[PDB]
Design an enzyme around this catalytic site. Sequence first.
Site, PDB file in Angstrom:
ATOM      1  N   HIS A   1     -10.310  -5.021   2.842  1.00 51.87           N
ATOM      2  CA  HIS A   1     -11.222  -3.932   3.181  1.00 51.87           C
ATOM      3  C   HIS A   1     -12.583  -4.517   3.524  1.00 51.87           C
ATOM      4  CE1 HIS A   1     -12.649   0.321   3.051  1.00 51.87           C
ATOM      5  NE2 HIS A   1     -13.789  -0.252   2.706  1.00 51.87           N
ATOM      6  N   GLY A   2     -13.085  -4.181   4.710  1.00 49.65           N
ATOM      7  CA  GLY A   2     -14.386  -4.632   5.170  1.00 49.65           C
ATOM      8  C   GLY A   2     -15.363  -3.472   5.251  1.00 49.65           C
ATOM      9  N   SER A   3     -16.643  -3.771   5.038  1.00 54.58           N
ATOM     10  CA  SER A   3     -17.681  -2.750   5.039  1.00 54.58           C
ATOM     11  C   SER A   3     -19.006  -3.392   5.416  1.00 54.58           C
ATOM     12  CB  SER A   3     -17.799  -2.060   3.672  1.00 54.58           C
ATOM     13  OG  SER A   3     -18.218  -0.710   3.820  1.00 54.58           O
TER      14      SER A   3
ATOM     15  N   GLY B   1     -23.059   0.096  -3.629  1.00 55.37           N
ATOM     16  CA  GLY B   1     -22.355   1.338  -3.910  1.00 55.37           C
ATOM     17  C   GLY B   1     -20.869   1.135  -4.131  1.00 55.37           C
TER      18      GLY B   1
ATOM     19  N   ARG C   1     -14.200   5.245  -2.530  1.00 50.38           N
ATOM     20  CA  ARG C   1     -14.148   6.652  -2.902  1.00 50.38           C
ATOM     21  C   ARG C   1     -13.601   7.517  -1.770  1.00 50.38           C
ATOM     22  NH1 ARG C   1     -18.843   4.749  -3.434  1.00 50.38           N
ATOM     23  NH2 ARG C   1     -20.080   6.624  -2.981  1.00 50.38           N
TER      24      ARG C   1
ATOM     25  N   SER D   1     -10.058  -5.841   9.198  1.00 53.62           N
ATOM     26  CA  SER D   1     -11.040  -5.403   8.213  1.00 53.62           C
ATOM     27  C   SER D   1     -12.401  -6.017   8.493  1.00 53.62           C
ATOM     28  CB  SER D   1     -10.573  -5.779   6.804  1.00 53.62           C
ATOM     29  OG  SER D   1      -9.561  -4.896   6.360  1.00 53.62           O
TER      30      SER D   1
ATOM     31  N   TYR E   1     -15.088  -4.365  10.427  1.00 51.59           N
ATOM     32  CA  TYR E   1     -15.847  -3.295   9.806  1.00 51.59           C
ATOM     33  C   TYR E   1     -17.003  -3.803   8.957  1.00 51.59           C
ATOM     34  CZ  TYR E   1     -12.431   0.079  11.406  1.00 51.59           C
ATOM     35  OH  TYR E   1     -11.648   0.904  12.188  1.00 51.59           O
TER      36      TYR E   1
ATOM     37  N   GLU F   1      -2.384  -0.373   9.261  1.00 48.08           N
ATOM     38  CA  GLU F   1      -3.420   0.039   8.324  1.00 48.08           C
ATOM     39  C   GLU F   1      -2.814   0.963   7.278  1.00 48.08           C
ATOM     40  OE1 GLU F   1      -5.796   1.696  11.692  1.00 48.08           O
ATOM     41  OE2 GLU F   1      -6.098   3.408  10.347  1.00 48.08           O
TER      42      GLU F   1
HETATM   43  O1  LIG Z   1     -11.706   3.467   3.348  1.00 50.80           O
HETATM   44  C1  LIG Z   1     -12.440   4.300   3.884  1.00 50.80           C
HETATM   45  C2  LIG Z   1     -12.318   4.490   5.375  1.00 50.80           C
HETATM   46  C3  LIG Z   1     -12.520   3.381   6.190  1.00 50.80           C
HETATM   47  C4  LIG Z   1     -12.411   3.469   7.577  1.00 50.80           C
HETATM   48  C5  LIG Z   1     -12.651   2.254   8.420  1.00 50.80           C
HETATM   49  C6  LIG Z   1     -12.213   0.942   7.813  1.00 50.80           C
HETATM   50  N1  LIG Z   1     -13.079   0.243   7.154  1.00 50.80           N
HETATM   51  N2  LIG Z   1     -12.686  -0.942   6.616  1.00 50.80           N
HETATM   52  C7  LIG Z   1     -11.453  -1.525   6.667  1.00 50.80           C
HETATM   53  O2  LIG Z   1     -11.234  -2.616   6.127  1.00 50.80           O
HETATM   54  C8  LIG Z   1     -10.463  -0.738   7.418  1.00 50.80           C
HETATM   55  C9  LIG Z   1      -9.153  -1.213   7.550  1.00 50.80           C
HETATM   56  C10 LIG Z   1      -8.224  -0.466   8.250  1.00 50.80           C
HETATM   57  C11 LIG Z   1      -8.597   0.759   8.823  1.00 50.80           C
HETATM   58  C12 LIG Z   1      -9.889   1.235   8.696  1.00 50.80           C
HETATM   59  C13 LIG Z   1     -10.842   0.490   7.986  1.00 50.80           C
HETATM   60  C14 LIG Z   1     -12.076   4.691   8.161  1.00 50.80           C
HETATM   61  C15 LIG Z   1     -11.856   5.807   7.370  1.00 50.80           C
HETATM   62  C16 LIG Z   1     -11.977   5.682   5.997  1.00 50.80           C
HETATM   63  F1  LIG Z   1     -11.771   6.768   5.226  1.00 50.80           F
HETATM   64  N3  LIG Z   1     -13.303   5.002   3.125  1.00 50.80           N
HETATM   65  C17 LIG Z   1     -14.228   6.011   3.651  1.00 50.80           C
HETATM   66  C18 LIG Z   1     -15.650   5.777   3.155  1.00 50.80           C
HETATM   67  N4  LIG Z   1     -15.683   5.465   1.724  1.00 50.80           N
HETATM   68  C19 LIG Z   1     -16.407   6.078   0.759  1.00 50.80           C
HETATM   69  O3  LIG Z   1     -16.331   5.705  -0.415  1.00 50.80           O
HETATM   70  C20 LIG Z   1     -17.306   7.210   1.099  1.00 50.80           C
HETATM   71  C21 LIG Z   1     -18.041   7.788  -0.091  1.00 50.80           C
HETATM   72  C22 LIG Z   1     -16.908   8.541   0.510  1.00 50.80           C
HETATM   73  C23 LIG Z   1     -14.810   4.363   1.347  1.00 50.80           C
HETATM   74  C24 LIG Z   1     -13.395   4.795   1.679  1.00 50.80           C
END
Ligand SMILES: O=C(c1cc(Cc2n[nH]c(=O)c3ccccc23)ccc1F)N1CCN(C(=O)C2CC2)CC1
Length: 350
Positions: free
Chosen positions: A199-201, A208, A215, A241, A244, A329
């Site tokens: 998971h990347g951010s 957070g 979350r 990931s 992201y 994914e």
């Molecule tokens: O995991 C996701 C998320 C990520 C993405 C993009 C993403 N982000 N990062 C990844 O590593 C990834 C891997 C495969 C596919 C998508 C991704 C798109 C929709 C989503 F709901 N989250 C949505 C935002 N998050 C939160 O905690 C916010 C507070 C509600 C964390 C959980």
Amino acid sequence: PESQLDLRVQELIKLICNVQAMEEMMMEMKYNTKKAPLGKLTVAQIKAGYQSLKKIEDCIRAGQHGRALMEACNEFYTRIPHDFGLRTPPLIRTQKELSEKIQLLEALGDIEIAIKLVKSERQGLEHPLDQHYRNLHCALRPLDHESYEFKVISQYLQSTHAPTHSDYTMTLLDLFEVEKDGEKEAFREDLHNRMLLWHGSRMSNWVGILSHGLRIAPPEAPITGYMFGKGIYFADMSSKSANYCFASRLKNTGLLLLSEVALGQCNELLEANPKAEGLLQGKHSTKGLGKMAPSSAHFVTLNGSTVPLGPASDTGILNPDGYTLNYNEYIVYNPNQVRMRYLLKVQFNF
Ligand SMILES: O=C(c1cc(Cc2n[nH]c(=O)c3ccccc23)ccc1F)N1CCN(C(=O)C2CC2)CC1
């Protein structure tokens, strides 16, 4: 007094709690850090922002791309102040434009948490880095480069770099073992198909994420902004990931998270569907199928989770009715199906 943290943990804390770096990333998302200061960020303000994005979604779904959409977007721009200079504020009408504002609202939410953490201060009893680290309620243990764990996750990171992400390579600078308070107690150990996934951010989100966990998106957010519903998204390919992280040539240091994911019975899907959660009916996770993925032959095991190592082999999936995902994914819809394990400090070599 002096800090009692390992020097590597000290650097990690300084990196993720850099409020001024958060200021810079928000200004690059065309957000007004002066008129609405990140020190004056409230959950209620972010809440109203999500609600405004929902009214926008209503207009797009209704085809009302005139006055109604203009006024809906202006409401979002008033609740979430933007700094477009003299540019006219742009209408939000596509899913990608919707997703972009969801990402912004997500980063503001995680900056709100971080600013509240750093602003809570003691005096001269503990080092400030030590107090931030304590306030995280998430242990971060530096692992040894020569250690065995560094070896396995390096191969995971390098061998799952996707070939269509050729604009950069990645170098592992440091490895941390993660143990967030309470995550192991909540984790669904009974579920099968436990995998160690990526998971990347953005860099602004890690305080957070580490302190509150990954979350579920709030109820008021528009459902169409999440391709597979309001859940937590992972990949088996490191670079998918790592995209992201939104690292740049000038900010080419990011963080990648590895987590144990209690996938259980996957509901496998070909194309996106924001309503995928209703389609589970019994199953525990959604798997979006990609043309390329690590093969079951190279899979290994670490602390009870399947590490899908090995070079990615051709899977054979192809969507005739439309777009075919390039890579897998996975989506779980409860944080109790997630246990964070490793935090990678990654150098992006553009
Ligand atoms: O995991 C996701 C998320 C990520 C993405 C993009 C993403 N982000 N990062 C990844 O590593 C990834 C891997 C495969 C596919 C998508 C991704 C798109 C929709 C989503 F709901 N989250 C949505 C935002 N998050 C939160 O905690 C916010 C507070 C509600 C964390 C959980």
